[PDB]
Structure 1
């Protein structure tokens, strides 16, 4: 049956110039909203079009971009994390954005700062997400437990509900993204006078908090799929998870889903969330005509309506001031207090390091330590000491 990618295919077959955009959206609301955005853009051009090409997941995309370098042909544009941008700048692969003529006035300074390398912007914030606290409104009401506003209330609530339901009710992936929440909110930072450190006392404390949660019966490790693909077996109260998960949790949940700001050290402020999602980069190899399509496409992506529509469709955070003044954004915020909660959460935001090696480290070295500690009951300090050695050895090579 006809789909957006068929409309795009036809638009691009008729186009005189096609700028390929390589992305990591495997489906769901993110892929649909990317494709909707592109259809709209392509309609307004006269045979100057973007062609989205799915490369799989984010890791699959960065592997395929690496392979594209080695075959000597890259797309016009791709999604990239900040650390992927640092790696692409080692090959001088990327065009400065402002040079293209993309205006970045009114882009979230948090987002603009993350894509600025030696003071030059190399990425356009596109699909930016923040961690939020997903919760089961039914299950908290069932036991008279308030939505926890502090890490202390969160622990207390997880223990109270786990005892009542006979099962661990805080669900989490044993991964670098989850670790980041507890780490940042315990005072952790990864760079110590510019050196990457995985085994600082806050890192040990954060990984020890999670392991103790599993041993005390209040934290449930999710070993297989996303948290929202595990719902329905046993009691669920809480997860800390990307706002881009919103639509997946909504579809999956057989209970009344809640979205809250993250528990923090005090009721003064929500906790910091990890910023995830990606920026758009433009490859130097692209033709003049392909770069001009990239320019107009990046200008369209940053428009208030494109941002309003994309962010309300997905639970991504609008990247511009102007998006919050767009009536489409405003109507959705009015009907759904979760949009507003997600934006409010976007104000308390921390990033991972932008090192070229950070992808490999976060998955294969830090992610593996966290797994060893959570699933194989490794001593948290021992597991992070090893991670630090392996990280040091990788950087040295």
Structure 2
């Protein structure tokens, strides 16, 4: 019987059920969440969590918006920082510390991100960092060191693409990939409080990617995840979420490597984009449902729950105590990629937490990146149209 079938039987028997709406569509994240939930439900006497898949993360925020309109929300949901900003406009969210959930020991990179006007409104749960995935065999074949700097990274992509007769740096033409180049060229999305999409660092970042396509070293991936396209043509590198770690390991026919990101200089690794979500608790939930949320949140923050979840997926453990847990230690001792993910999590940047950001990153910024990369639009002209559309949406 599948974990989701066991959870269904657990919730059928329970006297109180707290729904948790999520955006895991499958693979290791979905299985690891469901395993965490079965264990929690087993320790409870008739008090359970029911995880409800709502599609992807965009389907989830659409589903929560419908629930506001219908007047019926879940007890808990996954949320990005911008989704939290949006839900706070409706005063929909319970402050976490009012449930008595202790947050001492949560990574300040993650706790700062859920604090709005000095109050914590989410529990960091599944937090990812971008890493450098690479083909150990193909770098070794051609004598190419893992690149430590953006300059070395471009040099390595060109050398390997020439040797293998195909573009070896694979990328999705999206806001997440753009953020890695933008941040490590000195970019900042906010200037004196204003959102800017068309700064010289943005044009520099999109131009670097478009020039890589033209020069034959950068391969756009338009159908499926990078790890779902492996095996078609030579691959050397991608910049991708740590939460894809198990998918990469299972797909790659070559010796997979994980490195810290290339940076401006060898003095420090590149900054990676933080992705994944926080759990929020809705005010409209009953006192009995809120008590279940309190216990589930303390369970999710326990060193063992974090150790198992993070080693199953590639997410970054959110607590100091997770790294001191023997099950984490056992995994890290056999596989250095876990410590690599933690070290990269020290060099970590967030996108803006504006309530409108989800629409901007996909429909405005992501469309401009696709215009430049897939339809040969001039980078500055594509980003000037994005700036115009963002300015119109934020007024």
Quote the residue 1:143 is aligned against: 142
Residues 320-370 of structure 1 show CA distances to partners (whole Å, capped at 9, x for unaligned) of 000000000000000000001001100000000000000000000000000
Give the stretch that moved more between structures: 2-11 or 311-320: 2-11
Cα distance in 1 for residues equivalent to 2:222 and 2:32: 29
Deviation at 1:32, TM superposition (A): 0.4
Cα distance in 2 for residues equivalent to 1:137 and 1:111: 31
Q: Does 1:36 find its partner at 2:55?
A: no
Cα distance in 1 for residues equivalent to 2:177 and 2:63: 26
Cα distance in 2 for residues equivalent to 1:196 and 1:144: 43
Deviation at 1:268, TM superposition (A): 1.0
Cα distance in 2 for residues equivalent to 1:230 and 1:90: 40
Other structure's SS at 2:145 match: coil
Cα distance in 2 for residues equivalent to 1:269 and 1:377: 34
Cα distance in 1 for residues equivalent to 2:224 and 2:121: 32
Cα distance in 2 for residues equivalent to 1:287 and 1:236: 52
Deviation at 1:63, TM superposition (A): 0.5
Q: Does 1:220 find its partner at 2:219?
A: yes
In structure 2, the gaps of 5 or more residues are none
Quote the residue 1:257 is aligned against: 256
Cα distance in 2 for residues equivalent to 1:197 and 1:119: 26
Cα distance in 2 for residues equivalent to 1:113 and 1:196: 20
Cα distance in 2 for residues equivalent to 1:193 and 1:95: 31
Other structure's SS at 1:18 match: strand
Alignment of 1:229-308 (within 5 A): 229-308=228-307
Other structure's SS at 1:132 match: strand
Deviation at 1:267, TM superposition (A): 0.9
Residues 126-173 of structure 1 show CA distances to partners (whole Å, capped at 9, x for unaligned) of 000000000000111110000001000000000000000000000000
Cα distance in 2 for residues equivalent to 1:21 and 1:55: 10
Residues 74-115 of structure 1 show CA distances to partners (whole Å, capped at 9, x for unaligned) of 100000000000000011110000011110000000100000
Cα distance in 2 for residues equivalent to 1:214 and 1:102: 49
Cα distance in 2 for residues equivalent to 1:247 and 1:273: 19
> Could you tell me the TM-score, scaled by structure 1's length?
0.99
Residues 175-220 of structure 1 show CA distances to partners (whole Å, capped at 9, x for unaligned) of 0000000000000010111111001110010011100111111000
Cα distance in 1 for residues equivalent to 2:322 and 2:118: 25
Cα distance in 1 for residues equivalent to 2:363 and 2:172: 15
Other structure's SS at 1:240 match: strand
Cα distance in 1 for residues equivalent to 2:193 and 2:334: 45
Cα distance in 1 for residues equivalent to 2:100 and 2:277: 21
Other structure's SS at 1:131 match: strand
**How many residues are treated as equivalent by the alignment?**
395
Deviation at 1:6, TM superposition (A): 1.1
Cα distance in 2 for residues equivalent to 1:101 and 1:9: 28
Q: Does 1:353 find its partner at 2:352?
A: yes
Other structure's SS at 2:166 match: coil
Cα distance in 1 for residues equivalent to 2:98 and 2:391: 36
Other structure's SS at 1:79 match: strand
Deviation at 1:224, TM superposition (A): 1.0
Quote the residue 1:97 is aligned against: 96
RMSD: 0.5
Residues 273-294 of structure 1 show CA distances to partners (whole Å, capped at 9, x for unaligned) of 0000000000000000000000
Cα distance in 2 for residues equivalent to 1:357 and 1:113: 20
Deviation at 1:257, TM superposition (A): 0.6
Deviation at 1:241, TM superposition (A): 0.2
Residues 280-322 of structure 1 show CA distances to partners (whole Å, capped at 9, x for unaligned) of 0000000000000000000000000000000000000000000
Deviation at 1:371, TM superposition (A): 0.4
Cα distance in 1 for residues equivalent to 2:25 and 2:254: 26
Cα distance in 2 for residues equivalent to 1:391 and 1:102: 37
Other structure's SS at 2:78 match: strand
Quote the residue 2:379 is aligned against: 380
Cα distance in 2 for residues equivalent to 1:368 and 1:195: 21
In structure 1, the gaps of 5 or more residues are none
Cα distance in 2 for residues equivalent to 1:117 and 1:59: 22
Cα distance in 1 for residues equivalent to 2:359 and 2:69: 19
> Could you tell me the TM-score, scaled by structure 2's length?
1.00
Cα distance in 2 for residues equivalent to 1:355 and 1:48: 36
Cα distance in 2 for residues equivalent to 1:249 and 1:204: 30
Residues 42-71 of structure 1 show CA distances to partners (whole Å, capped at 9, x for unaligned) of 011111100000001000000001011111
